[PDB]
Amino acid sequence: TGIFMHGKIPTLKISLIQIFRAHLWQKIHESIVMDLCQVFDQELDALEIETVQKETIHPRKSYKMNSSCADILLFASYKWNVSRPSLLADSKDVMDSTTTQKYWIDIQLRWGDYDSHDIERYARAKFLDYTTDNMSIYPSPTGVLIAIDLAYNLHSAYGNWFPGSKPLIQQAMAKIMKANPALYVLRERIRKGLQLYSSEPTEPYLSSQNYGELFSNQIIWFV
Amino acid sequence: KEKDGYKPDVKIEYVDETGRKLTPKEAFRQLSHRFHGKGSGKMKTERRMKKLDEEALLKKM
């Protein structure tokens, strides 16, 4: 996993190992990459994309924090007009005087503690580091990096953008953090580890305006 | 950027081969099966297939 432990806290270590058992970090990263690729496939025609390619990421790339590699590759069938690297939430972005055919997407998961839980800054720094990095191999100089802080469940991306990519990524990330099975399993495991649960709103006791459902196909009993 | 301007209706769903919406836990189990390239045992296979045709018989009536 990508967790870094400052000092030996054996109890926390065993708890985190229990939570993340069974390659959960890898499963989450792979599921997120696949979901994003599926959304790109859905909106290919609107985005004038040629194809979506699942770049053969290294198996340990999910927690290879020192370096990185490309995750998704959008082939255009045309030269898009790309933007200067600006935060995903930056509504106002200017156009970079360049055009590209291949556009790469990178996904970076982090385990943010209290000190360094700023997804915006972390994604900015990691993009501006990997892009210039000599050991980081990317198909094209132009692309985007999306960072997900698991601990605080935050999301933000920084790199270049082409028309439509910004709204697409925004809504895709929102529906992701809402309804991704991998993150759901992570949240449930964290809840179980903390032994903290949520209550329920009793039951709509059958009323004179609700009794009509009594004779539906469902078999009902009155005690 | 001179972006296009529109609303992307991004919908992410997990479904089985029968077109039924998949529960998150079962979806994760299938993800893990495909990830590790291996499956369950004979008894669990029998149990799950028996549950499948049990629900089929229950709903057919």
Binding site: H23, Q26, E30, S31, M34, Q38, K54, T56, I57, H58, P59 | E13, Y14, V15, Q30, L31, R34, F35, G37
Partner: peptide
């Protein structure tokens, strides 16, 4: 529609350290 998420193998591959497609 939705496609089974095409995954890969980590251990006991008997192949090169790098990835297949």
């Amino acid at each position: 529609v939705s496609q089974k998420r095409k995954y890969r193998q980590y251990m006991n591959r008997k192949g090169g350290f790098n990835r297949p497609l």
